[PDB]
Amino acid sequence: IRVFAIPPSFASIFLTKSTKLTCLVTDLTTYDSVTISWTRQNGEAVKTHTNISESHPNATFSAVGEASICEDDWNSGERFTCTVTHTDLPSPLKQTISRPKGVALHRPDVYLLPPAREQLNLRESATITCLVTGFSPADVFVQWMQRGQPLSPEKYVTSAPMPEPQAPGRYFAHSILTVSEEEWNTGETYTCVVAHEALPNRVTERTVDKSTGKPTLYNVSLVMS
Amino acid sequence: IRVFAIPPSFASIFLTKSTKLTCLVTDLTTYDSVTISWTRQNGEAVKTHTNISESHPNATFSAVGEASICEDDWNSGERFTCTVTHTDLPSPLKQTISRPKGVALHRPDVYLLPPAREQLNLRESATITCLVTGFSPADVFVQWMQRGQPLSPEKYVTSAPMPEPQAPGRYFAHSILTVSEEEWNTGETYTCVVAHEALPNRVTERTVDKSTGKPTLYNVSLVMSDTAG
Amino acid sequence: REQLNLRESATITCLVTGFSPADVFVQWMQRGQPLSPEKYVTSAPMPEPQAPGRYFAHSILTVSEEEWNTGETYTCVVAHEALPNRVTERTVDKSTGKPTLYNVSLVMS
Amino acid sequence: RIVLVDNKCKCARITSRIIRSSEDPNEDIVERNIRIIVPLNNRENISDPTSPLRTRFVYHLSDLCKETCYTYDRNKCYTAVVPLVYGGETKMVETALTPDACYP
Amino acid sequence: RILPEVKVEGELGGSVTIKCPLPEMHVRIYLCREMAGSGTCGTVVSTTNFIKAEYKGRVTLKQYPRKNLFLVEVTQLTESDSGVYACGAGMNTDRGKTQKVTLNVHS
Amino acid sequence: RILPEVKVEGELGGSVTIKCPLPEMHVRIYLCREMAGSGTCGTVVSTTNFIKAEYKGRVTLKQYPRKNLFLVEVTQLTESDSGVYACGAGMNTDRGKTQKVTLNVHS
């Protein structure tokens, strides 16, 4: 018989460039004639709320409401309340959601490991691994661009942030991109691009191609007498 | 209150030489008389547990119920159940452990990647990774070593197994060490070993040092001699 | 390399071409951190000779000789609206162009 | 042809032949056709990687017409043994440097 | 260095089967199309689940332990300059290729 | 490696339309004409406003997202022997080519 709130993530915020927050209604009876709102610190109204869900097997109603709100006011640190008054919850309950603004920031550091040399023998499928290390907050958005085009979300896989035991407060993650050898054997430029809060610019990116691991020179000398 | 259903890990099975399934209680109140028992799918009881340990500093109790079952019965996918009974919950809580047949066995591919060149430019650490991929959905534990003396888990960290993009059910996982840059600079050859069921000998291995990773400058000299002979 | 003989100052040039409208920002970051605006110089968007409505700009960073000889990398980052992610960048160091050098050494008594 | 020194450890194969030349007199040619296949990136001690990178490559045409060698044979196997902690007890476990060549 | 040349013909509706020696070792068995442009070999199907993007769903493999044989069967052939296909075993494709064949889809 | 060979008779008043796969979205689609002397390919028109000097005012482009078809239309043809024209996309030219077409101009 509760209503939770979900804050949009900087990873989602950055690519969408639109800020919308919603409150999920859980275990409230599947009845209409409900109440829903988004009251700010000043109580200012918000955009209209649409896309109301259907009936559910466990007899719950999720009257989810999405409204469009600016970006800088989130950076200011205001508070939002999802007001709900249901038939089974006549007493109005006040939700709460806001930006923490408390955690310190450390900029991440980006690594791009090419596939192993042994892997370029079996000719099945290469794997390029982008690694992000030493970032304070738990949010980071990593994608990959090949030839100026962002790749399909299916192609690259990104794990959740994981803390380093050596570095307190810092996390790390890893994105993997699996491509055919032949495109990798041919000169092809793959770029891992990352967006994060503490980076001096909003975005960093690193790229590698085949023509990077070649030795600088030889010294072959067939002495023969 | 929470109760776990922890099957023995593959590493436990083929390194401890003793196969035992354990169920752990947590997030409950620090009470006693917690009837934590193991039974089979037929309702028959199994051998009890030993060495009830001490509680947690978080004022939450922790107890484990362990049963010893041979390797073949574990490979038989028998429906074992741990029951926890106490006054806290009027209904005993049951945890089910078994082996669901219907997963293909795929050889794990374990690959070693040393830190990048520009990684060795901040002059503070070197990050080596071993990545296992393509294996059967059986989840395994990893060991690392340097110069023949293996290392504690306090330094190197592994990753949870996640599905692979193009594979039906083949998984993948990572493990990394951030070590002192001077160590990997001064040799100190490192090795990642893992143990998985699909492996023929059940254990595979790879090793990396400066020499292995991208030799940027040779001086190979094929001095053929006594050319006549 | 003609410049890299006096061993006084190297001038890396971040030529930006084929962009519209006439607005762009260029920064120079080293080892991930930016540099003072007084070390690099940015020109103004001049119209392109063979493309009307499309401009181009320049940017020079002056390093001393030895740092470029140690191979320390330099990053030119460009901010403009038409970019898919609004930010792009390129990297350079001593070993960007250097190909393989087979120094052979035959010998037969 | 006449090259019964196909020893695939040092890679050599220096065969002999006679140019059935243009049909002049026995103005014939005698050849020695070497093809050495350097591993170059392999290790000094061929069965233990802890040894440094093998830089020098000695080639005498005496011992290769039959020893430390440079490459791996498909019909032979080279193995190794490795330890591990897993807590306290350390147990030697057997690995094979040549898979698809001696896999049990 | 063996050359088991086979001259199977196949149209779009025609299906072509290639016979390869199976050492029963089961570590890896594969077919590899040699790349004329690159001058090297390019895998098409192996013991692993990977498959060429252009060839997805059109080629399958059959293992016969009863006869110790490996079958590469292609249901549909789309006028490819059907180059030289090499059967092979083991992870290393260039060193593991045993036999090589080449045919013609047209006639 | 695909060779969708398409030809024409081609004179002076005739106009030729060349169909290229639209790579989708936008990635520098271009039509490149092989240079026989250099042995490589040379751009004649691309997504940018570049048009080859001798082809100035004689070539136009039409993208069709409704059919995903890229039409290269030349109003006037003459002595320019239809050697090889390749449809391509992406920044690099030689990497991004497909339809390796050639067509005669006389008959």
Coordinates of N, CA and C in Angstrom, one line a residue, chain B residues 1 3 25 28 34-37 82-86 89 91-95:
Chain B
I1 N 14.6 -10.8 8.8 CA 15.2 -12.2 8.8 C 15.4 -12.7 7.4
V3 N 17.3 -16.2 5.1 CA 18.0 -17.4 5.1 C 18.6 -17.7 3.7
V25 N 21.6 -18.5 7.9 CA 20.6 -17.5 8.4 C 21.2 -16.2 8.7
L28 N 18.4 -11.7 11.2 CA 17.5 -12.0 12.2 C 17.9 -11.5 13.6
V34 N 17.5 -22.2 17.1 CA 17.2 -22.1 15.7 C 17.4 -23.5 15.0
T35 N 16.2 -24.1 14.8 CA 16.2 -25.5 14.2 C 16.5 -25.4 12.7
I36 N 17.8 -25.5 12.4 CA 18.2 -25.4 11.0 C 18.7 -26.8 10.5
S37 N 17.9 -27.4 9.7 CA 18.1 -28.8 9.4 C 18.1 -29.0 7.9
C82 N 16.7 -27.1 3.0 CA 17.1 -26.6 4.3 C 15.9 -25.9 5.0
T83 N 15.5 -26.4 6.1 CA 14.4 -25.8 6.9 C 14.9 -25.1 8.1
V84 N 14.5 -23.9 8.3 CA 14.8 -23.1 9.4 C 13.5 -22.8 10.2
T85 N 13.5 -23.2 11.5 CA 12.3 -23.1 12.3 C 12.7 -22.4 13.6
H86 N 11.9 -21.4 14.0 CA 12.1 -20.7 15.2 C 10.8 -20.0 15.6
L89 N 9.3 -16.9 13.3 CA 8.4 -17.2 12.2 C 7.5 -18.4 12.5
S91 N 5.8 -20.2 10.6 CA 5.9 -21.2 9.6 C 7.4 -21.4 9.3
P92 N 7.9 -22.7 9.4 CA 9.3 -22.9 9.0 C 9.6 -22.5 7.6
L93 N 10.8 -21.8 7.4 CA 11.2 -21.3 6.1 C 12.1 -22.3 5.4
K94 N 11.7 -22.6 4.1 CA 12.4 -23.7 3.4 C 13.2 -23.1 2.2
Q95 N 14.4 -23.6 2.1 CA 15.3 -23.2 0.9 C 15.6 -24.4 0.1

